[PDB]
Amino acid sequence: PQITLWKRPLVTIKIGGQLKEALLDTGADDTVLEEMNLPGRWKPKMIGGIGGFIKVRQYDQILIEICGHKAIGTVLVGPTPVNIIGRNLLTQIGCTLNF
Amino acid sequence: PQITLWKRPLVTIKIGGQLKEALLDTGADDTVLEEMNLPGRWKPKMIGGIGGFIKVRQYDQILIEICGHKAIGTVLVGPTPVNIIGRNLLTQIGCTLNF
């Protein structure tokens, strides 16, 4: 689809039999959710934002569908105020910015 | 232009007569730039991100050119580690997400 930006670009994402929603975030290197269904052992990771640096839980090779486009990659769990789909998964679904 | 997402979508901007580069951030409601002087008066605002809140100075009705497309709107200025063009100006240049 073609998504205008007059509001936040929240999309249906599915993970672990749960439909959640998350923001298609071209400013995020990573995909970051606040919490994810019981998906295994995680590894420590540090990431940053404009307010400073936070500790997150890294889960690799996660199966996710974004608008029913299938993708696969690292999903971090961390204190993000909105769930965000970062470029790591945006490139897999063929998403570009256009103007 | 079409911009793929295999690296951060950094583009050239012109603001306050200075060329800079900045990050096309669909996960940013507002535009936040590194400390610079801009014309007019400012008012204090708080902006949320990863890592917490930051205090910014809000200038309204600022002209900025992003890859040759002029836009007028609110620019926040403060201690961001990266210049960020948020949806409030990405809509003004007709920037959309495509997949």
């Binding site: 965000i84 | 940013a28 409601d29």
Partner: peptide, 6 residues
């Protein structure tokens, strides 16, 4: 607001 991830 929010600005989003390095």
């Amino acid at each position: 607001x929010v600005v989003x991830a390095x």
